[PDB]
Design a protein around this ligand. Sequence first.
Ligand SMILES: c1ccc(CNc2ncnc3[nH]cnc23)cc1
Ligand SMILES: c1ccc(CNc2ncnc3[nH]cnc23)cc1
Lengths: 268, 263
Amino acid sequence: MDDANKIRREEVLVSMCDQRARMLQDQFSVSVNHVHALAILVSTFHYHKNPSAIDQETFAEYTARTAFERPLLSGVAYAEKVVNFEREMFERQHNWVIKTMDRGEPSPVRDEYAPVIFSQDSVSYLESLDMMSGEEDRENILRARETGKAVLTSPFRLLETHHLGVVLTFPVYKSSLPENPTVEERIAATAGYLGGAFDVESLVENLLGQLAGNQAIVVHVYDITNASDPLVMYGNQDEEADRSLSHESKLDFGDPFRKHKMICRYHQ
Amino acid sequence: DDANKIRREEVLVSMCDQRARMLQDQFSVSVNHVHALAILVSTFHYHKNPSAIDQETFAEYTARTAFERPLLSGVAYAEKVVNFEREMFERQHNWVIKTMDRGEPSPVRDEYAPVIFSQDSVSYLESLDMMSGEEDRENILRARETGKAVLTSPFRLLETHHLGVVLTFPVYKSSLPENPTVEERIAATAGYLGGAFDVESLVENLLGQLAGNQAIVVHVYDITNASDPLVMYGNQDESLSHESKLDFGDPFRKHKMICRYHQ
Ligand SMILES: c1ccc(CNc2ncnc3[nH]cnc23)cc1
Ligand SMILES: c1ccc(CNc2ncnc3[nH]cnc23)cc1
């Protein structure tokens, strides 16, 4: 309970929190970069190559063998853009119907869809699901294709596991995409979307739980995109912790549309 | 003297340590992306039949992903070819296996590692037997016997003559047994995925743009043989220094960064 010992108590909190934030940010960055590579893989080996080198078996094998490259992701998949005019054709060729994510039921008529055609086996239940039939995923698809860049959702409970996480989506464009394209041109040139699920609830707990001093510290991560409406991304905020001291560590997950932060406290 | 001396030491440690972290991190990112390319060649060239990868495709994919491999000047894939197979191999590729030093047709050897796929930045490697250079040859043998990424000593690279280090990963056939012996690894070897760390240019680019670069002297040494340190980066010069840790991921090799003030 001494002074000066409590200067050091805070010094250790600051160092522990800052290190955890740097680890989370670095590992997410590594994962985004490898998802970018997979988007380029689909472009080069599925679209550009005549004939395609990628079937479901191939995508499953390659993604399984490279899972270690994407540490915070529970799975990756590729969804192809399908406009309604094309839907009957697409379904006949694939020998399956486009399904809704809420029920796995045949999709109602929509202007367009994003059905998963390739999946890592860890997320095999995504196959044939229209990723535009979930609101988080729909919004991410639109912003991915309009901006040309990787985008993140708000935190929400993922399919099957119901774990609290965030989704990462990258656009894949046709070779007809003009140089210095307008948004309207990006949309017209969209082939599909390469997505991954950051299972924060399971995988961030696994990362943090293996670190020395974990039992001493409470770690929470927030999506603070809207200042007046912070959203829990990781942690049990209700859980009892030391109310007298906290530290805020910076996080940058790389999507300028979203903002995040980590807050650490001692248990008692 | 003297509180100012303390601050001067603290600045040196901080400057050197950050540079060391930046270099280790960039190396690590490149090593990891090279490992992914090794897996890509295995999946697309060997596991799929017929092969679903070729030079055009490898060149496009590696060009588009060059950003994933900082400090690498280029990547190439060399296939293992034993002498009995040479005639068939050369007929299939419509070219002759060449020596690295003169580009002359290779004399007969027990085996060869001719480059079949290359990033266009290292297009001059195509058809060269990578076993015809002693640093690359040793790297290839150790990659295939250990099953893991390996690094060379610093040496001067082809074409540019830049001082650098080569990274080599083995690629195996799916006939590789589980928990293989070294003999089983050799037997199951398909080829070698390599890249060149151009230290002289690309590490200079990384470190030389940094603030305070003019106030310090930075060296990186390969200290695999403690009695014969080899310069990887810096000048040939033999009080106040600081040693910062580097780990480039190959247990066969050891490295360190040393930083010093000028005056
Ligand atoms: C395209 C393909 C895949 C994805 C990734 N989303 C996703 N992945 C896994 N689990 C889910 N539950 C809700 N959304 C997801 C996004 C776009
Ligand atoms: C297989 C394929 C490519 C490599 C990489 N070597 C290499 N790459 C580039 N330049 C060099 N000059 C001397 N050696 C090399 C190693 C194994």
